[PDB]
Amino acid sequence: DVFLMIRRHKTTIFTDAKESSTVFELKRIVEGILKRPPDEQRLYKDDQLLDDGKTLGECGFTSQTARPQAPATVGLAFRAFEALCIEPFSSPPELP
Amino acid sequence: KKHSLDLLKLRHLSP
Amino acid sequence: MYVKLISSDGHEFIVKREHALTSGTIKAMLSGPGQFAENETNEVNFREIPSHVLSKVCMYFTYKVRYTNSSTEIPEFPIAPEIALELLMAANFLDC
Amino acid sequence: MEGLAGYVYKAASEGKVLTLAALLLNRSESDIRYLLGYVSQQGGQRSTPLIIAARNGHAKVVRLLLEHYRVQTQQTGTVRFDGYVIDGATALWCAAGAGHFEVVKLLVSHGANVNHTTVTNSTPLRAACFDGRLDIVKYLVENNANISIANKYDNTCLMIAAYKGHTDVVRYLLEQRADPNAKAHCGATALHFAAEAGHIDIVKELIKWRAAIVVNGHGMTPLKVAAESCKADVVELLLSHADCDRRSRIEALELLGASFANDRENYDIIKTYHYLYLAMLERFQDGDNILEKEVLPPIHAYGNRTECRNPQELESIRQDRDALHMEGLIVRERILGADNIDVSHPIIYRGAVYADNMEFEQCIKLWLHALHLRQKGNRNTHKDLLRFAQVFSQMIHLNETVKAPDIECVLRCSVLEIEQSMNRVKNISDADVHNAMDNYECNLYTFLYLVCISTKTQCSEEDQCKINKQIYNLIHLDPRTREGFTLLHLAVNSNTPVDDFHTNDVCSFPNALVTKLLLDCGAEVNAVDNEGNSALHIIVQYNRPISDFLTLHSIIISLVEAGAHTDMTNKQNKTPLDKSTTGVSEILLKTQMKMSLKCLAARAVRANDINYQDQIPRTLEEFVGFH
Amino acid sequence: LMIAAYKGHTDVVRYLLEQRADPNAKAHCGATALHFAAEAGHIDIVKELIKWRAAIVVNGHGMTPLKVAAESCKADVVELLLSHADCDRRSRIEALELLGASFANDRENYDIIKTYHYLYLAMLERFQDGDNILEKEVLPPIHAYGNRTECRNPQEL
């Protein structure tokens, strides 16, 4: 019951993953909406390459880290892979 | 004849 | 199935349909002459409100769908000082 | 100084000479005159130090004050401590009211104030007549003082002397050739006050001087006034004025017999029939120019009686007690009309007797008629509504059914009388605004008691709809007590006062049925008091969360489902979670909190003290106001 | 003091405690004053002894004065004993559960809505935090009470 966030340079996906699960389920559910094959997409998380389907915990996100209050940023890289060119959001105005 | 109404330390409650 | 939440800066914020329909005017925009009965985009346009407030709104969507009956101690939703008073008007406009 | 002014007040209180002399010397000329010419605030009522000397009969201490100084009696002070305590009176005014002749004549000899005019333009002779000492009254008029000083409501000194039992003052006043035909604000010309307290000697004194008979504003002759107060001794005296006629003679006996039927002090059922039979015998005595009774149409409140037009039907009700009381009530209504002040008080007494005898429905009819009559006269009837609440709670506590139309009628009367109470509070600025405010709070409490009694009765659909309509009408005039409490706050508050009579058994606040009724009728669930507490801020503070958890649970459910913010803050910025002061009330509220992003963002804006003025919608600037 | 607490005579017991009498008086069955006071539902007497700090001690039958009060459907003395400034969660929830239990089957005090509401209050106060949670130590099912296995969740309650 952990909430993950997958961010391209413009688009953004919010997904849910069971604790007793692997990376395969999230790869399938991000393939289904983005119509991209799993081999093309890479979970380029925190400037670190990841694996395909071994374990959720070793990738970098846990139940406590990826809370729905502020889920961790998991970038997505496609083949031409691409760099981590995720454009940040607009800067909030400076409060007085 | 209403079993419920038929229902209802004695040496300790003496003064 | 998935609602394509665009912002003023052009950032897509694709969230689930059930997560998006917790808002009021998101349901209002998805209804009307905006059904788009092929459940692939369901694009809703926000030409006026920035992208960071959309990010916070989507995290709140996941928060509200998750934390709706989980015991009584509901965790703390983090609001930065510099982004508030903009998330407030955004939540008012969204009936969120 | 104020500290030294208390020193000379204590010395003059004991009537000591050597103590005051040492405490009023060895200073400048300016401060000594201020010491003897300024009032002292003792017991919440300001008073001149010369007042406490004359009130205790200490003429010695004040005689040397006049000798050694130039102290005057023109100092503004209170009148008297017997329930008036209004200021404006002079120091000489209380000298006559203290019953001390020796202190009056010394103050007259040095700066007499026999012609003092206060806000009530009451001369010192007014208190002299109230005290009832002949020596003070005789001496004051000899000091060139007018005896024709009429007040704003024309309070002649002979009127207060006739009302009181001091027959020595009134006989001296008429010996000075005073006007006996003095009109009052209500038209009570002397004899109305005289023939009200049963003073047989006082009334005869004005009879010799031919005070005459004139009808006052309420349509009551002095003979009728005497018969209303169950004073048969002065009624017989007023029947020999040599101008009485037959029309005004039998009706005096009818009024006297009616008044004796229903009174607290003078309750004689044997005198009721005797005066009524004598009046009927005097009516039907000749057979020519007969004076038949002008029979009013029957009234459902007094049973189904149609007066007594024959001596035979008056005889058949001799031994039947409750018919005689009902018969006396109807003829009392006919004689005095439907606008008299005391036409409904015997109805209240008979209803109280019936309630003490557990005869309830007839009591409700009589009291409803009395309430209707008093509301026609447009008077304060908060005591009547409290009495309705008391009797209804007594019937409920005695396991007796309550008539829903009677509840609806008394609720309508309560709503209308609260409207007139709001008008009275708005109209009056500082005349009797405290009494108006207290009556308004009592009226709101009585309405709540009636609503509780309505909730604890079974009613039909139409009767329930009419009760809800009355509650709707009172809700949509926005009633508020002193501390901003709306009608919902008091029904939710545990500190709402409940009357010490049988209302304590049935009217318990908080009540889940009253609050659910108010929210169904459309009470402003988010309304705030003067302190900012909403209806939810007052239920969380409830100090009995486990004894009557049914009440506490079934009202937080009602308040939240009605649309109350479970997050909004008071003037001290305290969420009801922070103002929960209870483990149970916190858990019930957190279960019911439906969260919103608008609330979290507004809470974050308020917590960070972000300047939100001219940055948010106007409809939202209120939302940040309480979040 | 015990027979004063058992009876409704609060003047006698308040005069007795005004004389600096022993509040921790052990009996044959272990019932120490408050056990008799919170058995007849005398709220004022229990307040009088808590003012003199009569203390809470388990009697012979394994029942605190709070559990004695909750056993006899007397909710007000349960309320007063739940504010002893040393009460603990486990005792508070077991007292609320016992009160809800007692309201279900009694001749004088039979309210099934109070049964559900007090059971739900104890269950909500059980599962209020999610951390250091107090799950029910449910007994094995008994054939006499059907085949129910208590209510370990607020959903089944």
Side-chain angles (χ1 to χ4, degrees), chain D residues 448 451 455 487-493 509-523 525 535 539 551 554-556 558-559 562:
Chain D
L448 286 171
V451 169
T455 53
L487 192 64
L488 185 55
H489 289 139
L490 310 160
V492 170
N493 212 334
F509 298 138
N511 192 358
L513 274 300
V514 182
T515 302
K516 182 67 177 177
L517 193 42
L518 290 168
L519 293 173
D520 189 25
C521 288
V525 70
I539 192 51
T551 298
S554 281
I555 187 179
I556 294 172
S558 299
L559 282 184

PDB file of all heavy atoms in Angstrom, chain D residues 448 451 455 487-493 509-523 525 535 539 551 554-556 558-559 562:
ATOM      1  N   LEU D 448     -36.807  27.004  24.670  1.00  0.00           N
ATOM      2  CA  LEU D 448     -36.071  25.743  24.625  1.00  0.00           C
ATOM      3  C   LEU D 448     -36.751  24.663  25.457  1.00  0.00           C
ATOM      4  O   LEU D 448     -36.793  23.496  25.051  1.00  0.00           O
ATOM      5  CB  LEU D 448     -34.641  25.952  25.101  1.00  0.00           C
ATOM      6  CG  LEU D 448     -33.764  26.680  24.100  1.00  0.00           C
ATOM      7  CD1 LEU D 448     -32.466  27.013  24.758  1.00  0.00           C
ATOM      8  CD2 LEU D 448     -33.540  25.791  22.896  1.00  0.00           C
ATOM      9  N   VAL D 451     -39.631  23.412  23.488  1.00  0.00           N
ATOM     10  CA  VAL D 451     -39.185  22.562  22.387  1.00  0.00           C
ATOM     11  C   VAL D 451     -38.793  21.181  22.901  1.00  0.00           C
ATOM     12  O   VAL D 451     -39.083  20.160  22.264  1.00  0.00           O
ATOM     13  CB  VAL D 451     -38.034  23.241  21.622  1.00  0.00           C
ATOM     14  CG1 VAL D 451     -37.375  22.273  20.659  1.00  0.00           C
ATOM     15  CG2 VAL D 451     -38.555  24.431  20.857  1.00  0.00           C
ATOM     16  N   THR D 455     -40.443  17.637  21.891  1.00  0.00           N
ATOM     17  CA  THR D 455     -39.700  16.461  21.443  1.00  0.00           C
ATOM     18  C   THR D 455     -40.080  15.228  22.250  1.00  0.00           C
ATOM     19  O   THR D 455     -40.111  14.115  21.712  1.00  0.00           O
ATOM     20  CB  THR D 455     -38.197  16.702  21.543  1.00  0.00           C
ATOM     21  OG1 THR D 455     -37.869  17.147  22.863  1.00  0.00           O
ATOM     22  CG2 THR D 455     -37.754  17.741  20.535  1.00  0.00           C
ATOM     23  N   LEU D 487     -29.905  30.224  19.474  1.00  0.00           N
ATOM     24  CA  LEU D 487     -30.824  29.230  20.009  1.00  0.00           C
ATOM     25  C   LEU D 487     -30.242  27.825  19.936  1.00  0.00           C
ATOM     26  O   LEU D 487     -30.626  26.964  20.733  1.00  0.00           O
ATOM     27  CB  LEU D 487     -32.155  29.297  19.261  1.00  0.00           C
ATOM     28  CG  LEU D 487     -33.318  28.522  19.870  1.00  0.00           C
ATOM     29  CD1 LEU D 487     -33.674  29.114  21.217  1.00  0.00           C
ATOM     30  CD2 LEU D 487     -34.507  28.555  18.946  1.00  0.00           C
ATOM     31  N   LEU D 488     -29.318  27.578  19.007  1.00  0.00           N
ATOM     32  CA  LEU D 488     -28.673  26.274  18.934  1.00  0.00           C
ATOM     33  C   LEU D 488     -27.624  26.103  20.024  1.00  0.00           C
ATOM     34  O   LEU D 488     -27.483  25.010  20.577  1.00  0.00           O
ATOM     35  CB  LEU D 488     -28.040  26.072  17.557  1.00  0.00           C
ATOM     36  CG  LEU D 488     -27.424  24.697  17.316  1.00  0.00           C
ATOM     37  CD1 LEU D 488     -28.454  23.628  17.575  1.00  0.00           C
ATOM     38  CD2 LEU D 488     -26.891  24.587  15.908  1.00  0.00           C
ATOM     39  N   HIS D 489     -26.883  27.169  20.349  1.00  0.00           N
ATOM     40  CA  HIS D 489     -25.800  27.055  21.322  1.00  0.00           C
ATOM     41  C   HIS D 489     -26.320  26.665  22.697  1.00  0.00           C
ATOM     42  O   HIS D 489     -25.715  25.835  23.381  1.00  0.00           O
ATOM     43  CB  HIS D 489     -25.022  28.365  21.420  1.00  0.00           C
ATOM     44  CG  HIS D 489     -24.186  28.669  20.219  1.00  0.00           C
ATOM     45  ND1 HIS D 489     -24.094  29.932  19.679  1.00  0.00           N
ATOM     46  CD2 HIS D 489     -23.410  27.873  19.449  1.00  0.00           C
ATOM     47  CE1 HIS D 489     -23.292  29.903  18.630  1.00  0.00           C
ATOM     48  NE2 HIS D 489     -22.865  28.665  18.469  1.00  0.00           N
ATOM     49  N   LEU D 490     -27.439  27.256  23.120  1.00  0.00           N
ATOM     50  CA  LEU D 490     -27.975  26.953  24.442  1.00  0.00           C
ATOM     51  C   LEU D 490     -28.504  25.526  24.518  1.00  0.00           C
ATOM     52  O   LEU D 490     -28.352  24.858  25.546  1.00  0.00           O
ATOM     53  CB  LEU D 490     -29.070  27.950  24.807  1.00  0.00           C
ATOM     54  CG  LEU D 490     -28.789  29.440  24.651  1.00  0.00           C
ATOM     55  CD1 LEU D 490     -30.097  30.198  24.572  1.00  0.00           C
ATOM     56  CD2 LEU D 490     -27.955  29.938  25.813  1.00  0.00           C
ATOM     57  N   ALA D 491     -29.118  25.036  23.439  1.00  0.00           N
ATOM     58  CA  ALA D 491     -29.595  23.659  23.417  1.00  0.00           C
ATOM     59  C   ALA D 491     -28.456  22.656  23.337  1.00  0.00           C
ATOM     60  O   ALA D 491     -28.693  21.452  23.465  1.00  0.00           O
ATOM     61  CB  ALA D 491     -30.550  23.449  22.245  1.00  0.00           C
ATOM     62  N   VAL D 492     -27.234  23.128  23.113  1.00  0.00           N
ATOM     63  CA  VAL D 492     -26.045  22.294  23.011  1.00  0.00           C
ATOM     64  C   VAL D 492     -25.200  22.509  24.261  1.00  0.00           C
ATOM     65  O   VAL D 492     -24.484  21.607  24.708  1.00  0.00           O
ATOM     66  CB  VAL D 492     -25.279  22.625  21.716  1.00  0.00           C
ATOM     67  CG1 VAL D 492     -23.942  21.976  21.683  1.00  0.00           C
ATOM     68  CG2 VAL D 492     -26.073  22.164  20.517  1.00  0.00           C
ATOM     69  N   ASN D 493     -25.309  23.692  24.858  1.00  0.00           N
ATOM     70  CA  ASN D 493     -24.536  24.002  26.052  1.00  0.00           C
ATOM     71  C   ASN D 493     -25.015  23.189  27.244  1.00  0.00           C
ATOM     72  O   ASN D 493     -26.212  22.941  27.409  1.00  0.00           O
ATOM     73  CB  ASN D 493     -24.632  25.487  26.381  1.00  0.00           C
ATOM     74  CG  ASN D 493     -23.382  26.016  27.031  1.00  0.00           C
ATOM     75  OD1 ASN D 493     -22.644  25.271  27.674  1.00  0.00           O
ATOM     76  ND2 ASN D 493     -23.132  27.304  26.872  1.00  0.00           N
ATOM     77  N   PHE D 509     -30.196  19.887  29.281  1.00  0.00           N
ATOM     78  CA  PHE D 509     -29.354  20.336  28.186  1.00  0.00           C
ATOM     79  C   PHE D 509     -27.920  19.899  28.422  1.00  0.00           C
ATOM     80  O   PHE D 509     -27.413  20.061  29.541  1.00  0.00           O
ATOM     81  CB  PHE D 509     -29.420  21.856  28.034  1.00  0.00           C
ATOM     82  CG  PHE D 509     -30.789  22.363  27.706  1.00  0.00           C
ATOM     83  CD1 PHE D 509     -31.282  23.502  28.308  1.00  0.00           C
ATOM     84  CD2 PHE D 509     -31.580  21.696  26.789  1.00  0.00           C
ATOM     85  CE1 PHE D 509     -32.541  23.965  28.004  1.00  0.00           C
ATOM     86  CE2 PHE D 509     -32.838  22.153  26.482  1.00  0.00           C
ATOM     87  CZ  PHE D 509     -33.320  23.289  27.091  1.00  0.00           C
ATOM     88  N   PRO D 510     -27.220  19.358  27.414  1.00  0.00           N
ATOM     89  CA  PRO D 510     -27.584  19.194  25.997  1.00  0.00           C
ATOM     90  C   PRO D 510     -28.657  18.149  25.762  1.00  0.00           C
ATOM     91  O   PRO D 510     -28.759  17.185  26.510  1.00  0.00           O
ATOM     92  CB  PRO D 510     -26.264  18.749  25.342  1.00  0.00           C
ATOM     93  CG  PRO D 510     -25.191  18.996  26.358  1.00  0.00           C
ATOM     94  CD  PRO D 510     -25.872  18.848  27.674  1.00  0.00           C
ATOM     95  N   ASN D 511     -29.478  18.323  24.733  1.00  0.00           N
ATOM     96  CA  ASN D 511     -30.505  17.353  24.391  1.00  0.00           C
ATOM     97  C   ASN D 511     -30.369  17.026  22.915  1.00  0.00           C
ATOM     98  O   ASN D 511     -30.367  17.931  22.075  1.00  0.00           O
ATOM     99  CB  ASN D 511     -31.905  17.888  24.709  1.00  0.00           C
ATOM    100  CG  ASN D 511     -32.974  16.812  24.639  1.00  0.00           C
ATOM    101  OD1 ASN D 511     -32.692  15.657  24.323  1.00  0.00           O
ATOM    102  ND2 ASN D 511     -34.208  17.184  24.957  1.00  0.00           N
ATOM    103  N   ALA D 512     -30.239  15.737  22.603  1.00  0.00           N
ATOM    104  CA  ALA D 512     -30.063  15.327  21.217  1.00  0.00           C
ATOM    105  C   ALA D 512     -31.326  15.549  20.398  1.00  0.00           C
ATOM    106  O   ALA D 512     -31.243  15.772  19.186  1.00  0.00           O
ATOM    107  CB  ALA D 512     -29.644  13.860  21.152  1.00  0.00           C
ATOM    108  N   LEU D 513     -32.495  15.489  21.035  1.00  0.00           N
ATOM    109  CA  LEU D 513     -33.747  15.662  20.307  1.00  0.00           C
ATOM    110  C   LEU D 513     -34.010  17.125  19.970  1.00  0.00           C
ATOM    111  O   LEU D 513     -34.550  17.427  18.902  1.00  0.00           O
ATOM    112  CB  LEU D 513     -34.912  15.082  21.110  1.00  0.00           C
ATOM    113  CG  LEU D 513     -35.234  13.589  20.972  1.00  0.00           C
ATOM    114  CD1 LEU D 513     -35.588  13.251  19.530  1.00  0.00           C
ATOM    115  CD2 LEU D 513     -34.120  12.686  21.485  1.00  0.00           C
ATOM    116  N   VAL D 514     -33.650  18.042  20.872  1.00  0.00           N
ATOM    117  CA  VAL D 514     -33.821  19.464  20.590  1.00  0.00           C
ATOM    118  C   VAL D 514     -32.882  19.909  19.480  1.00  0.00           C
ATOM    119  O   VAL D 514     -33.287  20.626  18.556  1.00  0.00           O
ATOM    120  CB  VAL D 514     -33.608  20.292  21.869  1.00  0.00           C
ATOM    121  CG1 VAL D 514     -33.822  21.764  21.586  1.00  0.00           C
ATOM    122  CG2 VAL D 514     -34.544  19.830  22.950  1.00  0.00           C
ATOM    123  N   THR D 515     -31.612  19.500  19.551  1.00  0.00           N
ATOM    124  CA  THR D 515     -30.641  19.909  18.542  1.00  0.00           C
ATOM    125  C   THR D 515     -30.972  19.316  17.179  1.00  0.00           C
ATOM    126  O   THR D 515     -30.845  19.996  16.155  1.00  0.00           O
ATOM    127  CB  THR D 515     -29.234  19.514  18.977  1.00  0.00           C
ATOM    128  OG1 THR D 515     -28.946  20.119  20.242  1.00  0.00           O
ATOM    129  CG2 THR D 515     -28.215  19.984  17.962  1.00  0.00           C
ATOM    130  N   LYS D 516     -31.412  18.057  17.141  1.00  0.00           N
ATOM    131  CA  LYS D 516     -31.843  17.482  15.872  1.00  0.00           C
ATOM    132  C   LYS D 516     -33.078  18.192  15.335  1.00  0.00           C
ATOM    133  O   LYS D 516     -33.221  18.348  14.118  1.00  0.00           O
ATOM    134  CB  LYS D 516     -32.106  15.985  16.031  1.00  0.00           C
ATOM    135  CG  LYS D 516     -32.516  15.295  14.743  1.00  0.00           C
ATOM    136  CD  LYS D 516     -31.370  15.290  13.747  1.00  0.00           C
ATOM    137  CE  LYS D 516     -31.733  14.535  12.482  1.00  0.00           C
ATOM    138  NZ  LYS D 516     -30.638  14.597  11.476  1.00  0.00           N
ATOM    139  N   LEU D 517     -33.971  18.641  16.221  1.00  0.00           N
ATOM    140  CA  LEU D 517     -35.130  19.406  15.775  1.00  0.00           C
ATOM    141  C   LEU D 517     -34.725  20.772  15.238  1.00  0.00           C
ATOM    142  O   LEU D 517     -35.247  21.217  14.211  1.00  0.00           O
ATOM    143  CB  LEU D 517     -36.135  19.563  16.914  1.00  0.00           C
ATOM    144  CG  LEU D 517     -37.524  20.063  16.512  1.00  0.00           C
ATOM    145  CD1 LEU D 517     -38.001  19.387  15.235  1.00  0.00           C
ATOM    146  CD2 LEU D 517     -38.519  19.847  17.633  1.00  0.00           C
ATOM    147  N   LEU D 518     -33.807  21.458  15.925  1.00  0.00           N
ATOM    148  CA  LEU D 518     -33.372  22.776  15.470  1.00  0.00           C
ATOM    149  C   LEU D 518     -32.636  22.691  14.140  1.00  0.00           C
ATOM    150  O   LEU D 518     -32.837  23.532  13.255  1.00  0.00           O
ATOM    151  CB  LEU D 518     -32.490  23.432  16.530  1.00  0.00           C
ATOM    152  CG  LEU D 518     -33.194  23.879  17.811  1.00  0.00           C
ATOM    153  CD1 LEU D 518     -32.182  24.236  18.880  1.00  0.00           C
ATOM    154  CD2 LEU D 518     -34.103  25.054  17.531  1.00  0.00           C
ATOM    155  N   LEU D 519     -31.786  21.677  13.973  1.00  0.00           N
ATOM    156  CA  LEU D 519     -31.065  21.523  12.716  1.00  0.00           C
ATOM    157  C   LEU D 519     -31.991  21.093  11.586  1.00  0.00           C
ATOM    158  O   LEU D 519     -31.767  21.465  10.428  1.00  0.00           O
ATOM    159  CB  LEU D 519     -29.930  20.521  12.889  1.00  0.00           C
ATOM    160  CG  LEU D 519     -28.838  21.023  13.829  1.00  0.00           C
ATOM    161  CD1 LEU D 519     -27.833  19.932  14.108  1.00  0.00           C
ATOM    162  CD2 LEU D 519     -28.171  22.246  13.250  1.00  0.00           C
ATOM    163  N   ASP D 520     -33.023  20.306  11.894  1.00  0.00           N
ATOM    164  CA  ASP D 520     -34.017  19.966  10.882  1.00  0.00           C
ATOM    165  C   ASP D 520     -34.831  21.190  10.483  1.00  0.00           C
ATOM    166  O   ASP D 520     -35.172  21.361   9.307  1.00  0.00           O
ATOM    167  CB  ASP D 520     -34.930  18.851  11.393  1.00  0.00           C
ATOM    168  CG  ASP D 520     -35.842  18.305  10.314  1.00  0.00           C
ATOM    169  OD1 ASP D 520     -35.485  18.409   9.122  1.00  0.00           O
ATOM    170  OD2 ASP D 520     -36.916  17.767  10.658  1.00  0.00           O
ATOM    171  N   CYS D 521     -35.152  22.052  11.450  1.00  0.00           N
ATOM    172  CA  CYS D 521     -35.868  23.284  11.148  1.00  0.00           C
ATOM    173  C   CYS D 521     -34.982  24.312  10.460  1.00  0.00           C
ATOM    174  O   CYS D 521     -35.504  25.260   9.867  1.00  0.00           O
ATOM    175  CB  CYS D 521     -36.458  23.876  12.427  1.00  0.00           C
ATOM    176  SG  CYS D 521     -37.853  22.946  13.089  1.00  0.00           S
ATOM    177  N   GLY D 522     -33.664  24.156  10.528  1.00  0.00           N
ATOM    178  CA  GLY D 522     -32.783  25.022   9.774  1.00  0.00           C
ATOM    179  C   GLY D 522     -32.001  26.013  10.608  1.00  0.00           C
ATOM    180  O   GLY D 522     -31.803  27.158  10.193  1.00  0.00           O
ATOM    181  N   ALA D 523     -31.559  25.591  11.789  1.00  0.00           N
ATOM    182  CA  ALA D 523     -30.726  26.448  12.618  1.00  0.00           C
ATOM    183  C   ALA D 523     -29.361  26.637  11.973  1.00  0.00           C
ATOM    184  O   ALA D 523     -28.840  25.736  11.311  1.00  0.00           O
ATOM    185  CB  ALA D 523     -30.572  25.855  14.017  1.00  0.00           C
ATOM    186  N   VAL D 525     -26.061  26.176  11.824  1.00  0.00           N
ATOM    187  CA  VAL D 525     -25.173  25.254  12.522  1.00  0.00           C
ATOM    188  C   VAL D 525     -23.767  25.819  12.682  1.00  0.00           C
ATOM    189  O   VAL D 525     -23.046  25.427  13.607  1.00  0.00           O
ATOM    190  CB  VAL D 525     -25.170  23.898  11.788  1.00  0.00           C
ATOM    191  CG1 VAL D 525     -24.454  23.999  10.453  1.00  0.00           C
ATOM    192  CG2 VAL D 525     -24.559  22.812  12.651  1.00  0.00           C
ATOM    193  N   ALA D 535     -21.437  25.870  17.425  1.00  0.00           N
ATOM    194  CA  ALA D 535     -22.187  24.842  18.135  1.00  0.00           C
ATOM    195  C   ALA D 535     -21.324  23.627  18.436  1.00  0.00           C
ATOM    196  O   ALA D 535     -21.569  22.924  19.419  1.00  0.00           O
ATOM    197  CB  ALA D 535     -23.414  24.430  17.326  1.00  0.00           C
ATOM    198  N   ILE D 539     -20.199  21.615  22.343  1.00  0.00           N
ATOM    199  CA  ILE D 539     -20.518  20.225  22.638  1.00  0.00           C
ATOM    200  C   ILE D 539     -19.260  19.425  22.952  1.00  0.00           C
ATOM    201  O   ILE D 539     -19.318  18.449  23.707  1.00  0.00           O
ATOM    202  CB  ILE D 539     -21.319  19.589  21.491  1.00  0.00           C
ATOM    203  CG1 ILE D 539     -21.884  18.249  21.932  1.00  0.00           C
ATOM    204  CG2 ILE D 539     -20.481  19.426  20.247  1.00  0.00           C
ATOM    205  CD1 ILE D 539     -22.625  18.299  23.246  1.00  0.00           C
ATOM    206  N   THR D 551     -26.403  11.136  24.432  1.00  0.00           N
ATOM    207  CA  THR D 551     -26.623  12.542  24.114  1.00  0.00           C
ATOM    208  C   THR D 551     -25.452  13.116  23.331  1.00  0.00           C
ATOM    209  O   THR D 551     -25.646  13.722  22.276  1.00  0.00           O
ATOM    210  CB  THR D 551     -26.852  13.344  25.393  1.00  0.00           C
ATOM    211  OG1 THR D 551     -28.028  12.865  26.056  1.00  0.00           O
ATOM    212  CG2 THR D 551     -27.021  14.811  25.069  1.00  0.00           C
ATOM    213  N   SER D 554     -25.099  11.437  19.663  1.00  0.00           N
ATOM    214  CA  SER D 554     -26.186  11.724  18.736  1.00  0.00           C
ATOM    215  C   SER D 554     -26.366  13.208  18.458  1.00  0.00           C
ATOM    216  O   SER D 554     -27.312  13.576  17.755  1.00  0.00           O
ATOM    217  CB  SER D 554     -27.499  11.145  19.263  1.00  0.00           C
ATOM    218  OG  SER D 554     -27.572   9.750  19.022  1.00  0.00           O
ATOM    219  N   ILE D 555     -25.502  14.067  18.994  1.00  0.00           N
ATOM    220  CA  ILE D 555     -25.545  15.483  18.686  1.00  0.00           C
ATOM    221  C   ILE D 555     -24.321  15.938  17.894  1.00  0.00           C
ATOM    222  O   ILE D 555     -24.432  16.868  17.090  1.00  0.00           O
ATOM    223  CB  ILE D 555     -25.712  16.308  19.981  1.00  0.00           C
ATOM    224  CG1 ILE D 555     -25.935  17.782  19.696  1.00  0.00           C
ATOM    225  CG2 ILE D 555     -24.506  16.203  20.842  1.00  0.00           C
ATOM    226  CD1 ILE D 555     -26.121  18.581  20.953  1.00  0.00           C
ATOM    227  N   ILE D 556     -23.167  15.288  18.066  1.00  0.00           N
ATOM    228  CA  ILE D 556     -22.040  15.535  17.173  1.00  0.00           C
ATOM    229  C   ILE D 556     -22.339  14.984  15.786  1.00  0.00           C
ATOM    230  O   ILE D 556     -21.975  15.590  14.771  1.00  0.00           O
ATOM    231  CB  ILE D 556     -20.746  14.947  17.765  1.00  0.00           C
ATOM    232  CG1 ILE D 556     -20.366  15.692  19.041  1.00  0.00           C
ATOM    233  CG2 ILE D 556     -19.604  15.037  16.782  1.00  0.00           C
ATOM    234  CD1 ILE D 556     -19.220  15.066  19.782  1.00  0.00           C
ATOM    235  N   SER D 558     -25.359  14.888  14.578  1.00  0.00           N
ATOM    236  CA  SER D 558     -26.325  15.840  14.041  1.00  0.00           C
ATOM    237  C   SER D 558     -25.654  17.139  13.610  1.00  0.00           C
ATOM    238  O   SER D 558     -25.983  17.688  12.554  1.00  0.00           O
ATOM    239  CB  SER D 558     -27.412  16.120  15.074  1.00  0.00           C
ATOM    240  OG  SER D 558     -28.116  14.935  15.401  1.00  0.00           O
ATOM    241  N   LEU D 559     -24.718  17.647  14.415  1.00  0.00           N
ATOM    242  CA  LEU D 559     -24.073  18.917  14.095  1.00  0.00           C
ATOM    243  C   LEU D 559     -23.192  18.802  12.857  1.00  0.00           C
ATOM    244  O   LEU D 559     -23.186  19.704  12.012  1.00  0.00           O
ATOM    245  CB  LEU D 559     -23.252  19.406  15.286  1.00  0.00           C
ATOM    246  CG  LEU D 559     -24.001  20.055  16.448  1.00  0.00           C
ATOM    247  CD1 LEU D 559     -23.029  20.562  17.487  1.00  0.00           C
ATOM    248  CD2 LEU D 559     -24.869  21.182  15.954  1.00  0.00           C
ATOM    249  N   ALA D 562     -25.308  18.318   9.719  1.00  0.00           N
ATOM    250  CA  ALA D 562     -25.970  19.558   9.340  1.00  0.00           C
ATOM    251  C   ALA D 562     -25.055  20.484   8.554  1.00  0.00           C
ATOM    252  O   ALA D 562     -25.550  21.365   7.845  1.00  0.00           O
ATOM    253  CB  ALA D 562     -26.493  20.281  10.579  1.00  0.00           C
TER     254      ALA D 562
END
